[PDB]
Design a protein around this nucleic acid. Sequence first.
RNA 1: GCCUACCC
RNA 2: GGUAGGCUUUUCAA
Length: 520
Amino acid sequence: MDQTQPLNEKQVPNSEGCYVWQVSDMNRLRRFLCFGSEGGTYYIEEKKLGQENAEALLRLIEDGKGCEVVQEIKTFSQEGRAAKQEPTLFALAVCSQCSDIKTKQAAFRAVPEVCRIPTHLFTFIQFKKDLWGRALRKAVSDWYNTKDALNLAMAVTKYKQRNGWSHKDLLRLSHIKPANEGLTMVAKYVSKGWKEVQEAYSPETEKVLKYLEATERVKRTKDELEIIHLIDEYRLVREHLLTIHLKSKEIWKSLLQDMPLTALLRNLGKMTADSVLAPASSEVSSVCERLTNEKLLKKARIHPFHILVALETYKKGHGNRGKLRWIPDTSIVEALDNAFYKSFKLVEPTGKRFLLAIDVSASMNQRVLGSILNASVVAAAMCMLVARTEKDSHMVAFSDEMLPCPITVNMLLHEVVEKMSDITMGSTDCALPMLWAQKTNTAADIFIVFTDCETNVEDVHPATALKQYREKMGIPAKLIVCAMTSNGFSIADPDDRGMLDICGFDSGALDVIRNFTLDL
RNA sequence: GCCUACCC
RNA sequence: GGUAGGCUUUUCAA
Ligand SMILES: [Mg+2]
């Protein structure tokens, strides 16, 4: 009996013909929220991946899980555990339509806590289209009227329109009625324009006009000094400036001052190139100190993935799609690579013995989140995270055989990246870890395997490998399968309480692994 | 092959 | 359509 055969009825065949279990729908929801379905997986095409995921979603609703889904969606977004928003917003959209009315009413109810910025809403509304009314009109209206005039003003000027949707269309389609003078002004500004509003017009309301005026002013003035001035006075950001100003060193030195974190993160390369982040500079020193402030990273909801993508591209001196070059600053590379570990919800060590196994087979070459990072690299990063928290941990890599582990606990993130480079390839034997462990008489209480569960060699089933391990070593060893995709497969036996299914790249992954290690 | 802003 | 920034995919002051 090997992986080519089913252990029991419950099991189903992979994408390779070998047998595994089907991840619980709830768990697949999490996989989906974190990885989405762009580019699909190594075996499943993008389109069918989304279809497989859409099916599981509806299945949950069918089964009553309607409100648990929204609650989970609501929680992942607020806690910022998912790199990108599309999957969450698409999920909240499907729920916003499902048969259940409990779920639907819960979906629109959570819209303002999930759609924090215009883009989020625009993407939500567009999804509803790919799939107005009382609920919709109400939800959109509440999004604006519950805000503070002065805040809405920034929101609507920072994000005038995204993906084909403007606040002008939303305001009109929802037939909103400004809850106060401040909001009517902003609304009039949006639908009718500055002139109309300027022509039509409290201390609080004046503040709102002032601002709107500022935003209009920084687009007519030729004087750079005045631009810089307004930026200082009204905290105007990049989106507020005419793109011709974005070539001025002094504009950015003024823009960097209190630049939001994602903005700062996505423009590290450009600022270095324009000498705004010159070597040894105060500015650079400032940047590093901000990127490594866990609280602000947390406040700005900087996901570790975004850090990884920026680090990879930043040290490359040049972009992937971009077309500018810069001498990568070593202080920044050390600050980003440091920030990576602070972006995850950190936890107190348990002290247990962990065996961390990275699936490095050919399939792990598959690209994640439509980025330039592959599952191999991401799995290794997640691995480094768990290894720097629980010191008693031995890392190992595998494909269809045990391979010398290319990385170490003391390596900087970009060294672990290129090392996974030279080694990703081969077939998949997901039982090797447990098997290796027994053979080297290596003790462990927890096994964490970072895989896509597409095991395919004629060797015993990983679940079988774990049992043989328990019996042989006399340890109740548990097994945590950290998923690297949104496929619906798992080498984890649902009937074994010592086997858990978690998602890779959930900034909250650390807490789940802990709760499980500690029998919670 | 894509995102924005400005003019038209 | 013309022009200009950027692509670390859409820039979460939070
Ligand atoms: Mg493989």
